[PDB]
Symmetry: C2
Subunit: 167 residues, 2 copies
Amino acid sequence: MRFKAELMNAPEMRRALYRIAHEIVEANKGTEGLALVGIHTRGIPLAHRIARFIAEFEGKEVPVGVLDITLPQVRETRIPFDLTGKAIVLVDDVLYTGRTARAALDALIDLGRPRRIYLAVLVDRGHRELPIRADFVGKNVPTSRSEVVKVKVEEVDGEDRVELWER
Amino acid sequence: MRFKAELMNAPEMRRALYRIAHEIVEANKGTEGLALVGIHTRGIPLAHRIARFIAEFEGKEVPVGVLDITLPQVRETRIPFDLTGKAIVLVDDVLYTGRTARAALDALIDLGRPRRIYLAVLVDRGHRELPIRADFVGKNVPTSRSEVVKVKVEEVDGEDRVELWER
Ligand SMILES: [Cl-]
Ligand SMILES: [Cl-]
């Protein structure tokens, strides 16, 4: 057994992402100065979806930036806006030790001074090694040190699914 | 009307600090590679006390570093040890927007690579502006934007007390 079990399926993900979308707006009391930044590869597609959903029930569109950072490497950085004074939501597919999130947080701050910075993640598999936490979480997945969470999304993997693996 | 109410008294603080101490050891499964770093002024005295209590029921002594940072200023930085590979516990009196904690976290990482970094605070008054959270909390105090939390400690104020104020 390398593959262990299915943590999420497409419907469950769509549902979670909608909740995230709402929770974000509720938190920012609106769309004012709101912007999303996708990180860790699949965080980008997820950000776009969250933006799609927000506009869908809010009307206005939320800008989506990209900071494809992975651990200390980044494939492409695109932030078409001024981070200063804005309410920025970092979107990550999986929160693990928190080091990736922290690295992203570091990078944002070197680029501007947001009014606030939230952290939204599809799944939080625990095992923090830093005082970082997600403001918004799709699903909490208790894991063991040896297990591994694999997030698959249409835009990148041709399918929406969250898998639990183990070595 | 600036003073509103007493949030904590000496006994309640001692009690909380003891729980913190225990929770810290339980978390690190021992004293191995454990060290505390006091920040934001009154965090220093609190770190020392937490260390005093750990040694009191654990035997071995835990090193206490100082990183007196306040928001971006520091009065004195003393870290008599190598942060690398260690389990470091940042000790703060009050967790507010999380910016002070984040700044401290930034500084630590520029000095070494701890195996882990925990955040321990006497009181968490909410209103985060960053994805930071405390691993250990003496007391959670729901506040309003206008309220202010004042922590008084013997070593610095001649008295142990936590006060709630408002403007
Ligand atoms: Cl992470
Ligand atoms: Cl803070």
